[model samples]
Target chain A: IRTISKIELSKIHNRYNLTVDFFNDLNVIHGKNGAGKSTLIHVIANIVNGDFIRFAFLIFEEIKATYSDGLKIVIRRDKIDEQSFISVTLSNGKYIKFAVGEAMATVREIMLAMDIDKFVKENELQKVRASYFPAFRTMLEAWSSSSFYNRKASAFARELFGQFLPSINYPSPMEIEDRLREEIRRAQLGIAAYESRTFSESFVKVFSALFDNGELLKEIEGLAIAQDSSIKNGYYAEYSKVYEEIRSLINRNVENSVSGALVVYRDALRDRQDYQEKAFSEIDNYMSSVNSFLEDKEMAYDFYPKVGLKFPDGSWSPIRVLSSGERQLLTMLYAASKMGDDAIVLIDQPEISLHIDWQEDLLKRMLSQLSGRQIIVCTHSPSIATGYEDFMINISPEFI
Target chain B: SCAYTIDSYITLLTMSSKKRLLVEGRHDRSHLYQLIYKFNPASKVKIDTAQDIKASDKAMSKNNRLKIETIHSKVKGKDNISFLCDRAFREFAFNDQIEDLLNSHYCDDSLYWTLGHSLENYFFNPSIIIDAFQFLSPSEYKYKAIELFSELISSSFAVLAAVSLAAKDIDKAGLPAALIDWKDIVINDGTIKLIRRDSYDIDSACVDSFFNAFDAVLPRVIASDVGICSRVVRGHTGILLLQKLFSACLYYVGREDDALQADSSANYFCNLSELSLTTALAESWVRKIGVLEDVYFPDSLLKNI
Candidate 1:
């Protein structure tokens, strides 16, 4: 697990020096206004996101972060010269000193040393090194953007979009909904295949799709579509062997398939009962978390015509009808969904558009869902920190 | 860019903030908190109890400087309703001015009166219970599920109905309102009956006074679903009856032998403190029947803000 253990900020905002320790799982940072709470998270975001250009531009004298993978990265701006350049030193004696203007071009070199390039390209299986929710990300996009639709040139091109935006980790609710639809597809395909104990080529695709490295669930899906097959059309291996053996025996003048027909289905039904729980685990937990916090309507997981709400009248509507608070909550839930298995999650001002009641359980619910992942949140609301005092960090101008 | 006034933004921010409903106790808070948004989702509603307020007030009075702030904080629940039982709300219903004032003391949605006796009445409701049991419909009696479900409601809610109709006289006579003995409740197949226990000073006259009165009105109040009258059942007692009935139904619905023996033992659930299943079931009841819809204070909080 690649995780940040500690960070040392020297002369941040050219005044305060802070050393903050991060827990492997939970960390909360609270502070007075303008006292480096926002900057601290942004610094982590910029470094892990490989937004080196933004990292070089931020007004900090020196910054060092230690990772659980026995790697330490230090960023110093003026140590080289007064040319708006930054020097990075790795624990394994790797060095990169590039001008802030050309940080974009040299980012690939920096990312290669840290193996972030592979991590980024590693697909669903890679433990996401970093996921971030910038301050006011959801509400901003909800009100200002063109109808809550924003996907970059490519999902992997998040680093490329850093040329304009401060951070590209912010996901709109639409992107999250798209991911949810796909998650349901994967889940349904996986669940049906497992329940039937079928080993069709398409059925085998699910194992590799979920439990495999980057390759071809897409290719398998295309093949299945071309063959006019789907998750439903898969053959049951154990049952099929019995079927074939009995059929051959009957043709050769022998007994039949009625011996344990009831038992066969009873066991199958038991398998269905069991697998459905495990199969729907991810989507069920995701929807449960978001829906519990939601109001008026619940976010449904129907694998739908639209990734939307289940209304009081048993009607469905798109997420566009959600309010700013609803959208904000939606966006945060989406942000949580897109996190890497063992990623460092940074959330700033989580209480925005959230009431105290919701704020109180926000961290509790998020931590519950993303167990074993490191989450560092910046908040102004004390209610959000309830029962989490042991993991909280009160960032101050003082050293403590 | 500058569409609204500076003061307006503050007001808007305040509106986006959560509101609170002042309930009687923590139990009331637990039951009502989950369902507030089901009825009205535009405004986020939180639950606070006056018991919690008084405890905080005790702390407030202990401190010197903070004591000043409590005076301002000790006001009515703003922009939301304080849920009270029908007995409490309707007691002063004869005075038209106080009734109107009690319903809307300061804010329009200041106080909400429970439709039935308490929150439990909603869960035990025939329509609501039928709706709830659809989720728990047993396959063994799949064809006869509704029949058994009706039987369950009748057998179970009858316990609530008896206590509800006589609840007023029971309280007035100071005969312990909550059922004291588990042995008195006979859990049978068709209809589980409650016999008055010999535990305390509950007299023959007291039993004749309320029990006979309860017998007369059971047909109108419950059988006919006189919703308002049907709702007036005892709260904790209704929950106890339902808790006992959950296992009663579960046993007949067919569980393994271990469950059978454990439940077959008389007074199994009655000895322990039990909260019934999720408000997820009860929440649908609040919306489906929605008798309390009339008492729902108009949602002016959002429009005004």
Candidate 2:
């Protein structure tokens, strides 16, 4: 939550000492034609992180530090220096300053590495085995070995199905049960079919049952090959057995040295059992209870599947055939969905396809969809700008 | 004198279709109607002696017909009469009366033009007649002959006959009653007052009683064939041109009370548009003329100048 308590600019055209209190949830800066609007935005965003100035530095020789606090940063782009100095002033007031080098090759290297330039000359392309990369390359190299291979495999899977199933990397008991039920459905529908347990399918089912149905794991005394606990083969045995023993022992002997510790475990086990039982039974009731769960979970289903429309002549059309409004709504929903929940959205001329009445509505919905992320929108449509009066900030530059 | 035989002395009255008058008349029906169409289209008009001319019994009745026609033309139908008289009648009457009424009571040829037509040809009773022509001695009975039936002529028509005779016989050497001394009466003493008498037959009891009595006998004479005007403008002597000219002179000469008191037997003639389309256009002379831009010259103006 961030709110600007004040802002100062030399020229705001008939407005001087232009300090305004803005709500953190939404802020609207409105000025007629000539107001120092763009400068205000830059002043605020730069307050959070000075590294945001890197992009601005490409054109200008100097980027002055205009704001003093929040995630304190000091940025000064000198008039003659090619290196833009950006320093983070930590909340404790210690300053960490760094200057990006002025070397042309280094500049090109950083720009190329960051995908700032799309094309690299053949000669300047980093050699495959070159050891002269930046200091942080080791970490990237490590990620690449595993990530590069996984990326190829995932790409193939993605080409067929949208994504790999069971996104939980190490499945919890409830997660395994959920995954098992989904796999069963997929297998029934021939998404991934396997008959033999001796193959990969057997190992998957065995592991799923161990986690999903704790009863199977609890019933096993030991593995025949290595005298290991059957359900928790090795690593899991330490915590799970200790946990189970502590809770059961506490119930039998409530007056013991471990009562304080076991009490919590006892209560946790009971809560876990309740959740596990519900999860276990939930799979059984999937066909009947899918919607019961859907009511709570956001399933990416169309919240507004059917819409009613009023036309210019006051005629109406059902959602299926609504023309312009439908196009606007579809484009907005599609854009939000494509960006997902956490993307910084940049929209241009969102009002081109929308009617005046719906222009504001689309903006409102878009702003709500873009709540947690940054968004920069450009539009010449007055309907969109004036409708969402609070969100419209006219961007312009000011001379130093 | 009774049958003047002089073309210039006689007045012929006729009515024109309101629209046809447009091209042939002055300022169309609007101006003409405003002047006299509402009232007497009769040559021999009977006025309430007590009332003003606009409100006179004969004038009121004539105006009522016009008003009803104007207010609702379809139901009321057509009614208009124009008088084309030669001489200025009221002027002739006043001219004749001033000479008799003023000092010496001497009336003559030199004063012929000065006589107002209101008193010009009237011989209502033989006693007044004898007294009026008393200045004439026994030798000239031709003068007495001229006097005999002159009273029978309408006052407006009388002016027509009088102007013609004066202009003609004023040069005749031995006409009786031709007195002169142009000065004594022609002096601008500022009072040109010369009313003859109540020409109307009604006993002046109440205004309405006078009108009720007038309504009975007046329309017949006012509307008679010898009347100044009838339906549409026809004969030149009919439309009250000279009478209007006299009326206008009376007005200009500051004889407002007498101007209003005077009467017209016929409609003041002019041309104008069809009365049917008049209501929406209000009342305009241009529309009345039917013809565009052609101004009708009233015969009265032609005779006067």
Candidate 3:
């Protein structure tokens, strides 16, 4: 639940007796190639996520971490005779062990009492997760292009939107049709039952008029039973007309019910769309001013729904038209937004394909937006390191 | 382009001395031309590659053989011509009388034979190998580059062993006798047994043969030193080892394949510009070879001048 206070690595990545202390929310690691910068980031990620197996496999001897909550977890690889196994010891005297290649289920079982995810969700990280961006983190041509349903962006949007929004479930057209049909059938059956229950007043009045010529009610009933052929034909015609009217009434009711359901669905969809657009506006607000990082800018970047960029002249350009450096900046910003405020974001070599000016401004912009979250960056750029010089960890063996 | 016919060489003679250096392929001509220019930058020379040259028994096809002879007869007086051919396995097949073939085919035109397997063998001179490491990897100190190179070469034991075995087979068949001891060159666990410390050293006779053939075309001293490098590098296996080292260095230093592969002919010098060859070590290498002065200008040329 707490930020990592200290990380001590022994005999990992061929570097011996290395230890680093994190004293701030923002930290930069600078080193030459093969100086264990990436390895250090990977170790931190594994520890934060309770991915003990990944942490165990990377250690040649041991790794010890102290959290802000005074919770200490030590993971070590010890050789027994000729076999090696991983062991974890917590400060609270909780011990768990596994063979070199065994399932890490034991880790989850023992640590469930102090479930790191639940703990982090309450204290340090509300949505505890980590997202890593490599140097070449940009979309392909097809993915970055502008289209209503751009295939590449569509695929990525599913994952991106899935993380931020709850899915909306809508019934299929066939299911709605079947539901309306059942309701209409039930109404038809009820109409038939009511027809048998009562006689119409007009028909009863005709019968009474015919019976008025007779002296008694019994005599009128007998006359009605022995009715003339022409009168019987008229009664049957009236009955058929009444039944046709009831069928037309039921059909109209079904049509109105189906139409009303569709109207409600349309309104709900519009409301959700408005909410989604508002959420995307958050991303657009940052992108519109991101062009300030550019030294020689022809146009500021615009974020359209389908990932298109707009120019100052009011024309739209596909994301593919931007240079690799620009795409990297946009891509990193877009990814960071999806991570929410509860994640530990690790970005490696953000300076790749970026100009020195862009690289210098990237950290400032990222910090301005992601100040609430823990952000760790590994870079070889002196410009980026300049901003975080006080919190920089120079990863040379001499420094270690 | 230097890939022109013998007819073009004859036409070229009207304008200049028409000095033409021929080798097996474009790769060889590029490397040799660069070496010559590095030795003497002001020197203007045209180098050609035998388009049909082969590693197989058909070194030059029948049609190619006819054209070569035609060019030889027509340009013999006007052009100064030279040739360097790979000894390969053909030395034994030719009854170890390759010198007689060079004399009869390219007589007085300055023909040279690789002492071991191919021209790549001469690149392994202990100092050249050291300088190559320094030239390709300028960031690392010379000692560190050598250390890296040594480790790299040691890991390549399997490839080195294969080349040694192939060369040993050719030696058994009585060719340019194997200059490297197979057992000594075979490495294990980063260490090579020094059974024959001078296993790849060339005999004085082999060095002189290269010098005599190349004197008319190249500076006599540089030509002789090129021959002497055969001794320092330990012959053919040493050259193969050096080739692997050079390949790894090029790959490590991020030299693209297109940058390294020189285009055909007269543009060979132009191709050198694309490569990172203007290093301090490279200039030092040129100066080292420059110490040998030209002493083999022919009397006929003197009289013509």
Candidate 4:
């Protein structure tokens, strides 16, 4: 019930004034590619992200919202030579003005109150669930640091990690390293405990004492008996023979101590296998029931941080093996799975990689799975538009 | 879309200034005009009754060739003119004269064709019948046409034989006598085609000789169901029964106010004179089957040409 009922934009996106009213839970904005659909979606994304500064720059004049709960908000930024004056009128009807640097925080508090900050979050696994799935989600199948990949993959990676293990951040290298280090420290503690035991230390000392007693007596007797042959030669020969045996005994003890540390570090490395095994098992269980309704065999999450389609023989093939359509469907299902009940998910041209059959069923599946959540999609596909005709909005610039 | 009626047709004539279509009567006039309008609204052709081809022939006292030649002369040099007549028993008898008139300077660039049997036959097409049934109230009233036509097809020959025997005493008695000699009478491809007995085997000489003595008699037939069935083919004659059955269905379903008795003139025709065919309902129907350019060509000034 706490949904954005209306959004009116002025002097935004090529100075075109636009009004988008969401009377139904599902709103389909249909228009040609460059008819400002994506621009408006971007602005809405900024608003959802609580990035009012970005929204302010994109929306030069003002953007207003009338919420379903009777609360209203008007965000405006006046243009000037140097610093722009930005103000937000909350539901209280009082205006709060702030400078560019910190205005987003104030605006965010008002927007976030209605649970509209999901899109800006790193992933939907967070308590807040509103989000924007940009048109290009197929890239989430692989790992890349390029902005093209970063923009789409990072959010998806968080959701994938969340679905498989809601407790950890899989995409962050530093976090992965930190976890490994903690496990290693635990492993080191085991090694240190083993070495610091009274039994092992006393045993090593006692064995060394025993070796010195046996070797010293033998060497003293050998040296006296060899007194006729030079005293220096007799002592060197006896000590060298004793020294080799003693060093071998000490090396055995050191090898035993080092082996314990090696085993622990090795166990730390195997922790990822446990995580991967659990992730695959969890993902497989969820997808087994879900894939029964699907026309194709569904893909499951992979241990290598890449997505792969599941095979009938209980194996997985990398995304490169699947068709582009399959990859796109995987991304869409992944995004849909992470949606919150109160979320308002915006998708742009979801039909880009879908077959006609999928396009027809896309809205139905999304609606059924994410019941009560508001979904606003912008598309040029007639199949998607006609399929959801009751919720469709024919966005004609001439009419606007 | 406005419903077709006689008043609408009258209004259509006043607004139209382009081509003029000459049909047989108000029945053909109403149905053909509306059909054309439904196909293409931008067409501005007008329909005028050709005034009973049978009666017109009765009034003419010339030889068959001269009669057709005279009518052809009157229509010659006329701009934006066309005529649609019935293909009664006289078609083959006057084939030479009719064929001459068809290609002559008098009717050049003008449309001239028979209605196969009549306008009723064209309406009997299942698709059109189905389309019209949608407009009927109680919806279930549509099956009457199918039932009536099915029975009419079975009893057609007996009806024709009885009519022919009754007309045996007079050489030019009624249409049944003319049709009784035909080996077959059936509906084919949305129209009626009559196949003559072996004795009337047609050739160039046989056709010319027949045209010379073709002082065709117009049958004074009664309006009873049997008489109507015997004169026209089964499919053509069953349309009225369908209308009557449909009207009775309307009454049975308690929609008496909208019902038109089978005898009512309006029951048989679709007068689309006043309405714009561009309306959603009209356009949707036309789009389903697609429009034939020939249907709208009089006003189209030959778009295909």
Candidate 5:
């Protein structure tokens, strides 16, 4: 609900004079994939709302963050290792350092508020979690630092919640429940609730240990030396529940439209079998053109395939396979799919997967299919950029 | 350190304060001009001319500030009596007996024939004329004309016979005359025949007839002045004695003063500055493949300075 009002950063690395004071209803970026896009997004999210789940795994060795005095969360990383090893040195005279995974904005804010300093000392949770779940203190660390590509990061995270090793003993469900409650009590109020209960004292420790703060969650995740096959299923189960909540929130606003609202319907039936087939065929022809230009290998086409978007009652697949170029097209469409008539949409390199010929139809297709949305695209291709000279913002060499 | 003397029986051109260039005729001037334009891009040189010479003796006889010069083949050939016939009246203060001796020795004007082409044409080949033309052609037929010329020069036959022989070699890879000619001219020294016996009589009616034949066919041989044969024969067309005298002047003066003045277009046509000839892109490419790589004119002998 809340948005970033301001940010200021300085002096931790070689490059200087890095400053930005710009924000708008919509902004388009045309940067390389790994050049700190995710970092900026997640860091901004962390400062404003305190959940770094969006950028849970990325590390910036040169950046230091200040949220209020004494509660400053500095994101430092080892350049050589990409270790997003956050050293949370608090002004309250305690340090809880760990790399945490990403979470929703609200959950991250709550964790940041819960004193990471006190939890480590009071119940002696640090040592035990540090031993079993080194990543528990740095949840995003394990997920982000995985050698796999970013495309797979979200998929992996959504699949691996709560699916690590379970408690050792064959305990009763009520016993486990009481243990979890006590742990939450300790984390919320800093005292174990189940000391008087029949469950073992260790059970209470686990709950408080897991929920205390982002750093502890990172540490728990870091305990993983190698991947266990069971993790993805467990994580996905937990992540799906949270993902549905965010998706529903965004979808609800879309469902509730007033008069003067702009609804984008590319085919009115792109999701319908009758119309999607033709859209897919268009992509197929473009793929052939791309192959002819490249002449040797069909790299872009090989990576792109048909995607089927499923709704509750019906499923719609594009007519032909959705190539990576078409996927980029679809992404641009999705980015601008809001129902509000006043919505502003921005896209970068809409021609990344498009052929030179297909690029000619970009603005034309956008105009004919999606109406009322003010479209902004960032691109370097002269074919696309030249045609839309009136709307272009040319960043000169020096400016870039 | 010490003053140097250039001895020659031919014409010379100076490119710099310290360097001199030498060549055969008017055609050499244009070729050298192009060559200089390729190498240094900017150069100024003084070129000298010599009208004729009897032999190396007449060339070395002249003395001035000469430091370097080159003789076209006239220097080694027998003297031409015709060149002296006109000048015998007074120049050089020669007595009647000496003038008579000079007139008897060098009366024939066609140097290529009178000098017994073996001694003159072979020595002062102007081979590069053919060479330059061949190189300027398409890659495949670049050496065709010269290859033909070489075959003719190698044998005792006319140029057309050699051309036919070389052309057949090109088409079917067999030209028996070329094989015999190559061996005689390039491989064996004894196979060469000297046309020195006055029986070859350069000024005789037979020689005059040969000249008439060439004059008649000249039009058919080359369409324009820039044609390959025109460029090829331009330097060698003069009388042996005239060539000798011009070479003698170049030999003594080292280069033509007026030639370097940029006004003497005729002199500019043959002799050129090293800087001018070696700096041209087209000429330099020719020189690179022909002059630089030609084993006949090896690199060790070519000093740019």
Candidate 6:
């Protein structure tokens, strides 16, 4: 994972030096107006996306980003060339050049350093895998063949919406309404196994049956092997076939029988169900417990089923009709739910269209729903990171 | 012998997590909690009296433990100062009398007797009282008020000085201690005042004989001015004199309403002495008694953990 683990900058717009470290899973950066909350989010997205043209306009002397692999990409202002605005250097001594002419190829070589082509081919990297949703409007590529207006968020569309659609053909300019029309409510990022000690011990016995005795005896053998691609890729999707085979042995209930094998697998099966529905209460909390602005419209959860109001008759419309306050909230939580653990979702000003309760709702829901992913958000709201003081970066200024 | 009786409670004292400093009563406990915090601000030693331990008895019953909770006054054994004196007496006063024993060796450095007879005795210096409540006196009379208060401590506690010496003689000859509560205990303005020239019992002739004998050398051996502190003369009468001094200044300043308010409890003066200690007079009080430098109470500071 190319997690942007740390962000450092020499001097930014308004003479501010930034030394922003990030919490591995969640980070909330908050500052006053023009404290560069929007600029920092845009900067992170532009850097990872290799959009050096955006860097040309911002007034930072130097910006260096460290990723999970401990490699850094440092872009420093080259005051030498009036023609070229800035130059980026890879920490691994691979490529270093200015951003105008030869800088295009220089970034291509840097992308190769990050294996960016493979992620791009896999359709996993969208705007270099940071979905930086800005709160205020900035003009984007108008509209896509996909449903939604706002060229402001146009580059954000290719990641897939409406049960993963891929339509990139640009449409005519339309105002930012009905932009909340998406197919799915959430992309449940699959994560850590149940931490039950008894189950882990029983899982070891199952692993011993699957692998050779001596080989299975090695360190942390059960879950380590189970979580590996070979095991989880297959068993995690469906639990019935092997379970029935074990249950056949339990029916005899005799010695020299794996009699209790059904019970172990049955309990593990229940734990798996327990884990899956654990998300329902939290996601259900968003749609069901959501505060109202009733024009006699009731907000209902779809499992992302065409998320909007359900009336007495079985009918529906998108949540785009709601007020901008309620509209942006559904927009933000729906965006967060769409993100998997694979992407770093950078949301700017999640507090914009809401009151304090709704501000608190965005935080509780984001971490609850997508706790597995690296979430980096910028906000002006204190309530957004209320209980999470450790993760909040109050960007008091530091001049170079 | 009574030391063993308090041995069970002393075990509790020894088990206390902080190094212990047992004071005699609540006044000593409260005053030292302020003064020692000035000296050793972190309060490394736990200071409490046997009475405070007895108060914790209710705290114990509020939880209902089966163990005997009370550590009575008899167990504390005739006050902390006397208990320490007995500890010294048991050890042969480090091979000297109480005078040299006290001067050189304090038996348990963790526990202390006040340098004077009580905590208030240390405040007997006239400079401390006027330094604190100087606004009580008129501007011009500041120097004279201080001088007058100094004379007051000398004359009033002269009566206490005579009583203390005669009491010591009664103890020596194995006689009952006389009850010589002085009558007409006057608290009047500077020229008119107390040590009341009359007594409630006109004369206890035998105690008067000892007072007469000690009267000559009392000036030379322990001058009435010097012996007024350190000796018990200053504890009760000393606080009262300073209490009157605040009002006497008011009376002369034509603040007659303030002067007429009698405080028989003398509670305000106790607070006045505490305010005076915590105020400008702190270092003078701590230094006048002393800081135990050689003891190396944790953290290389008279200040500690």
Query: Which candidate should be chosen as best, given lDDT against the real structure?
Result: 1
- Model 3's CAPRI class? incorrect
Which candidate comes out best when scored by TM-score?
1
| Residue-level lDDT for A43 in candidate 4 | 58
Which residue pairs collide, candidate 6? A140-A151, A140-A152, A141-A151, A142-A151, A162-A183, A302-A305
lDDT of candidates 1 onward, in order: 0.55, 0.30, 0.47, 0.45, 0.31, 0.47
Alpha-carbon RMSD, candidate 5 = 35.4
RMSD, one per candidate, in order = 16.7, 42.4, 32.7, 28.6, 35.4, 27.2
Give candidate 1 misplaced runs (Cα > 4 Å).
A79-84, A104-128, A143-166, A191-259, A303-306, A337-342, A398-400, B1-305
Of candidate 5 chain A, the 10-residue stretch with the lowest lDDT total is A128-137
Q: Model 2, retained fraction of real contacts? A: 0.00
Instruction: Provide a comma-separated list of chain B TM-scores, one per candidate.
Output: 0.53, 0.15, 0.44, 0.41, 0.26, 0.48
For all candidates, the clash counts are: 2, 57, 2, 1, 92, 6
- lDDT per residue, candidate 2, B209-238, as tens digits? 323332443333333333221111111222
lDDT string, candidate 5, B56-160, tens digits: 355453521121122323333322210111111211111211112221122222211111211112122334434433433323222433444354333222222
Give per-residue lDDT, candidate 4, residue B139: 40
DockQ of all candidate complexes? 0.04, 0.00, 0.00, 0.01, 0.00, 0.01
Cα deviation at B49, candidate 1, in Å, is 14
The segments of candidate 2 whose C-alpha lies over 4 angstroms from its true place after superposition are A2-22, A28-50, A53-69, A79-91, A100-104, A110-339, A343-349, A367-379, A386-400, B1-305
lDDT of 4 by residue, A193-255 (tens): 543564465556455544441344344334334432431121133434543564456456534
Please state the Cα-based DockQ of model 3 relative to the true two-chain complex.
Answer: 0.00
lDDT of 3 by residue, A1-400 (tens): 4577688888875455667777547778776777766667667766666655554445468889887778787888888877678777778776666675454454334243245344444443332555555443444332443222233343463355321111111111122223334433443354344434333533453454444421222332233333322211222324334334544554565344333433333333333334433433443445544555543443222211123445666576554466777756765554444323356667778778876546555776777664366667888765565334557776654333
Query: What local lDDT score does residue A66 receive in model 1, on the 0 to 100 scale?
Result: 80
